[PDB]
Amino acid sequence: PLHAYFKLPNTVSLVAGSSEGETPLNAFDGALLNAGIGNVNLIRISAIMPPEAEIVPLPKLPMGALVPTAYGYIISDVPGETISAAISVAIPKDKSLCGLIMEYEGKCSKKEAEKTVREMAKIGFEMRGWELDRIESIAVEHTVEKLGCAFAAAALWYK
Amino acid sequence: NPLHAYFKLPNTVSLVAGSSEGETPLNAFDGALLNAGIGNVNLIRISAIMPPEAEIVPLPKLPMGALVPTAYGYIISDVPGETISAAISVAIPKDKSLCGLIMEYEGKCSKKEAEKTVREMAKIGFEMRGWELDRIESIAVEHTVEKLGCAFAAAALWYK
Amino acid sequence: AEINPLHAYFKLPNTVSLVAGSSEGETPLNAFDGALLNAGIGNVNLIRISAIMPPEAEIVPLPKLPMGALVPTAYGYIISDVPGETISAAISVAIPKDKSLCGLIMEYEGKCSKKEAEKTVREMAKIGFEMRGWELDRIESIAVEHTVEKLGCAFAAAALWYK
């Protein structure tokens, strides 16, 4: 590749994690680290999986990389409160179309968050009137001890 | 002919706006993006600055999933009958070596008020810089909430 | 000279610059805009990052950025329309002893003094390194405080750039 070819991300990786922290940002950083995406820069995106992009396990990312990432997170300082974050990726039957990435966060269980985010993806496809192939999702819940963060993401990268 | 153009700074800006009801805030937001014509690309929220010599152009054909540097304003409301608006403006300088200022606004007001407000914000930015104004281009959108709606306005940066 | 970090994903910033500023404004966005200008980073496109300084990146005074530049920036800001209210924003960059490791960028803003904001953000950076169990070389930080007259914004950032 003697000449860098412009391209849209072609991989999407679903990760999720949670962590306690002394401050909201430290808990967030902890959640990222727990999710396996803690030493890279997350560039928040509105969430669209580029056509022909493949869902793959999180690639080995260069530290400090500017990773276009669709994510949802929630931080709580209420002891005993269970918080969750979930990400869904609606995949089209028509491969020339894009996938839809939805995120959800709330004071609920992992199961509810995942169900809600998957439903949101479905709704997005209905709004577009696109044929839905399937929905891939991930979710995580965290029971706050003192200060915790639940985080779920779809990291877009290049294979 | 310039190569690696996409690896350089965006040279176009497109003002788009839209609104939509949604079963959830994000679904409403997604609907507004779709209604605005940029629902199938990735919006990368930016602080809002039109690169010098860039041109305001109608929304180009964007590749789905594109990482579009976008300055935007949006408002979501679940209050039936409430009118919410979003507007975007870009102040273009007379001195073409200078950058354009992109301002975004949102609120519980009419399309007219949102646009007037966002235009003044762009003008003020130029006043703060002491830059001579060529013109201010803007667009606004209002949405009367039925159950849960989102009004959205954006300045999408892209390439020639 | 021009670069879109979102497209040139393979080209990571190799410098980081701490800037801070504050400003009054007729609207929250105008105040925010005024703060960027006061911080010296007012005519560029800020792409917010989560806050990781790429390994081997050097802390340098903010370079002359071309207008409209897409600048990956870790930042914190606070806007207030309460007269007399003192607001602050601070940024810290924890630098590792092992240069092959990344630096951690923490941001903090609140209704407090410049001194408190900086102390807090510095502690946050220290905590980040302790959570990783990495050897901390030092913490570079900056803070700014603004006493709101009508509507003000305090802004602090770690702008990632190239050299």
Curated annotation (Swiss-Prot), chain C:
One of its GO terms (molecular function) is arginine decarboxylase activity. Keywords: Decarboxylase, Lyase, Pyruvate. InterPro entries: Pyr-dep_his/arg-deCO2ase, Pyr-dep_his/arg-deCO2ase_sand, Pyruvoyl-dep_arg_deCO2ase. The keyword DNA damage does not apply. Its cofactor is pyruvate. It catalyses: L-arginine + H(+) = agmatine + CO2. Binds 1 pyruvoyl group covalently per subunit. This is Pyruvoyl-dependent arginine decarboxylase. It comes from Methanocaldococcus jannaschii (strain ATCC 43067 / DSM 2661 / JAL-1 / JCM 10045 / NBRC 100440) (Methanococcus jannaschii).
